[PDB]
Antibody, heavy 213, light 211 residues
């Protein structure tokens, strides 16, 4: 079965450089054309670059030619995307995809995708605030972190039902999001309800207990 | 180069109904039109390739037609597992260009939002800030309007709103509304209220607190 796994997504300053890599397995790599496609919530899917099976031909759209460089290592079965002079506009999720043809064609297989963030903003852990007040509804406010992502669970994943975690919204400089969980009234505050927030970027992990005010 | 106009952008339909998505190319593209399905969080999934040929493994209820500039993708009868985003891609000339997509929504019975308000947490006031959160949960349709009134008077500066995707269990929506404001501004007022007008109610459902 075909498998494509890319890595290298990270936070980078404008004008900086990055090198995404894509590991391919489950098929004879040197026979297919490979490619990079990026996706944003406001511009959708967007083809970034394609390279032929032999590596001889490489194609790029205008907006990215000159700065990006696609390349392949047919011995290692790895694909690469060298990016330079990144712009805030290159911020996107980058997908590694295969072409069914030896040169270029439609895309039949896609990797999980790696996310790139170009910004001058500094990595900063979030401030976690507990939200205290049939069943009751409690919440958690994760404020001012950067970059994404942040992992929010309740009782370390013990509370699954009734949880709503809203998409982070880019504030002015930093992100902020909220999560709410609802539980039977007989279980709170008679039972403790903690909210856990992990921000891998800053190696931070906070546990905030929701106590009645 | 070649431009592809997809439509409709978003389509709300109920289970079992026919779904028709259209993609029109600016230039004759032959039969080199492809279609992809994308569920939230996951990457695109190849459904139909050049020549309107179904990719193997895709249910027969999916199909596409067209040659030239007018292409049609249809789902005979939409099931729960079909709720996703669909994209068309022309692979006739560089640059490869995709359609803008069609986001599908499950049409379900209306439902009022369960609103609740939270005054700022102690430790936040301590750090000089004061955010007031208001959760409006499990409602539908998604269209709703929230307004923050700091003592009868409305506020527009300092509001952050986030919505969730259609729930994969009850097909409903939920949104978070956060009124942030200086600790001072906070302490120097009293009645904070969260007003929400939803298709499901004549009277704007209100939730407030004092001090």
């Amino acid at each position: 079965e075909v498998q494509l796994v890319e890595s290298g997504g990270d936070l980078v300053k404008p004008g900086g450089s990055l090198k995404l890599s894509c590991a391919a397995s489950g098929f004879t790599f040197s026979s297919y054309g490979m490619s990079w496609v990026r996706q944003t919530p406001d511009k959708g899917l967007e083809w970034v670059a394609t390279i032929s099976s032999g590596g001889s031909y490489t194609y790029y759209p205008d907006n990215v030619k000159g700065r990006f460089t696609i390349s392949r290592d047919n011995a290692k079965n790895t694909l690469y995307l060298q990016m330079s002079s990144l712009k805030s506009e290159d911020t996107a999720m980058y997908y590694c995809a295969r072409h069914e043809d030896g040169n270029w064609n439609y895309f039949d297989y896609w990797g999980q995708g790696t996310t790139l963030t170009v910004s001058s903003a500094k990595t900063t852990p979030p401030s976690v605030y507990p939200l205290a007040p049939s069943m009751v509804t409690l919440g958690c406010l994760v404020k001012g972190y950067f970059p994404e992502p942040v992992t929010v669970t309740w009782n370390s994943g013990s509370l699954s039902s009734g949880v709503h975690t809203f998409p982070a919204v880019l504030q002015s400089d930093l992100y902020t999001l909220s999560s709410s969980v609802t539980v039977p009234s007989s279980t709170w505050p008679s039972e403790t309800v903690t909210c856990n927030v992990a921000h891998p970027a800053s190696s931070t992990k906070v546990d905030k207990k929701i106590v009645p005010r | 180069e070649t431009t592809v106009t997809q439509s409709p952008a978003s389509l709300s339909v109920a289970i079992g109904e026919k779904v028709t998505i259209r993609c029109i190319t600016s230039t004759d593209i032959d039969d080199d039109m492809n279609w992809y399905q994308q569920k939230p969080g996951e990457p695109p999934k190849f459904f139909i390739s050049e020549g309107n040929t179904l990719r193997p493994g895709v249910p027969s209820r999916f199909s596409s037609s067209g040659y030239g500039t007018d292409f049609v993708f249809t789902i005979e009868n939409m099931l729960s597992e079909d709720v996703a985003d669909y994209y068309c891609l022309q692979s006739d000339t560089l640059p490869l260009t995709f359609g803008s997509g069609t986001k599908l929504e499950i049409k379900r019975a209306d439902a009022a939002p369960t609103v609740s308000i939270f005054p700022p947490s102690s430790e936040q006031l301590t750090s000089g800030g004061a955010s007031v959160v208001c959760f409006l949960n499990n409602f539908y349709p998604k269209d709703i309007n929230v307004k923050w009134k700091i003592d009868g008077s409305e506020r527009q500066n300092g509001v952050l709103n986030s919505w969730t995707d259609q729930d994969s269990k009850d097909s409903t929506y939920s949104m978070s509304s956060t009124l942030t404001l200086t600790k001072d501004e906070y302490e120097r007022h009293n009645s904070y209220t969260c007003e929400a007008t939803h298709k499901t109610s004549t009277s704007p459902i209100v939730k407030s607190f004092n001090r």
